[PDB]
A = this chain, B = another copy of it.
Amino acid sequence: TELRCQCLQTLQGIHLKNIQSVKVKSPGPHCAQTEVIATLKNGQKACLNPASPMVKKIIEKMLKNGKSN
């Protein structure tokens, strides 16, 4: 009934060397804000800022993982 966001905070853009996975959970009838949650390769998690131009480079890269240095 009274839900919110899955993340109260977010990152501005951390090294993608730690990020092992990226999860995007758009807003809803509860949270009218985005909340990107990435999984750390260490088992941790680091929320990203969907209002950052670096968050659109940490994802697209993730889907690429590695191409050539």
Contact = CB atoms under 8 A, between A and B. Distances in A.
A24 interface: yes
B24 A68 contact: no
Interface of A: 20-29, 32, 34, 36, 39, 50, 56, 59, 62-63, 65, 68
B34 A65 contact: yes
Give chain A's interface secondary structure class: loop
Given A50-B63, A63-B50, A65-B34, A28 B20 contact: yes
Contacts of A23: 21-24
Contacts of A39: 25
A68 to B, nearest CB: 7
